[PDB]
């Protein structure tokens, strides 16, 4: 086990931490395209789960 597997410096990589970020972002973006949350509201919720 290395620190690379835990997270990659690039966003959306193969890291476990990266996978959770992309998965959480996709769920929020699903409602973003449903016209129920603004862009500012979307990013605020994304940061709060970091």
């Amino acid at each position: 086990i290395t620190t690379e597997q835990l997270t990659t410096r690039e966003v959306g990589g193969s890291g476990v931490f990266d996978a959770l970020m992309q998965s959480a972002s996709n769920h929020l973006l699903a409602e973003f395209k449903n016209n129920r949350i603004t862009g500012g509201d979307y990013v605020k919720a994304y940061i709060a789960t970091m």
Partner: protein
């Protein structure tokens, strides 16, 4: 004047720049969400043309024997009447200038002989009456009597269809007011409390723009004329 597509671009790169209803390139609104903007856009134009007397349009009405009420509807226009149920139209217009029922408030009426006709004068036997805002009533239709009605008119209703209108003709100083009202309608639709606070800001901004135009009179709303009562009163 500009196409409705430019309005979509302006909204895409404007107040709605951070919304989920815009395209990935910020070039246009989502196609399925376009009718939402169109409904709001028509509503915004109606309010602007009410507070400000920007457009003054006139129509021609021909008196028909045996008829007293003359609704100002497109089904009675020569270019849009159905001969099956209408014996003959009495509203006259052109092929490229079809009547669009844009009547808001009647201002003055002149007959074919050039005499001003009083409106809603209950004590005047020859005066005309308006039982409804968009209905004109004449109590004595003559043989060759033709009436011209000059009224404050709204902007023609926009439509995404090809045959419908696809252009906007408003003073460019009111463009921020148009965008603010559309933004207010969109953010008010979302029921999140954060969007509610943002919605009120645009509505307040829209009202501020309208009063600024009135304050400086950028649309030539104020009108004056030379005094005529001095001669009529016999002051000499």
């Amino acid at each position: 004047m500009y196409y409705i597509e430019e309005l979509f671009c302006r909204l895409a790169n404007g107040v709605l720049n951070n919304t989920g209803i815009v395209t990935d390139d910020r070039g246009d609104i989502e196609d399925d969400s376009k009718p939402f903007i169109i409904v709001a856009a028509n509503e915004a134009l109606t309010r602007l043309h009410g507070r400000f007397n920007m457009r003054n349009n006139n129509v021609v009405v021909e008196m028909q024997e045996g008829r007293t009420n003359y609704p100002l509807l497109a089904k009675y226009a020569v270019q849009s009447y159905d001969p099956n149920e209408v014996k003959c139209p009495f509203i006259m217009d052109l092929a490229g200038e079809k009547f669009a029922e844009d009547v808001i408030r009647i201002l003055e009426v002149y007959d074919d002989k050039g005499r001003r006709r009083p409106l809603n004068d209950r004590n005047n036997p020859c005066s005309l009456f308006t039982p409804r805002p968009n209905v004109l009533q004449n109590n004595a239709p003559k043989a060759w009597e033709v009436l011209n009605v000059m009224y404050q008119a709204k902007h023609p209703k926009l439509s995404t269809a090809e045959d419908g209108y696809n252009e906007i003709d408003i003073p460019d100083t009111l463009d921020p007011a148009l965008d603010a009202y559309i933004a207010y309608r969109y953010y008010t639709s979302l029921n999140t409390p954060e969007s509610s606070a943002k919605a009120a800001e645009y509505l307040s901004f829209y009202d501020s723009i309208c009063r600024e135009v009135v304050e400086y009179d950028l649309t030539s709303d104020t009108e004056v004329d030379t005094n005529t009562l001095f001669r009529k009163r016999g002051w000499r």
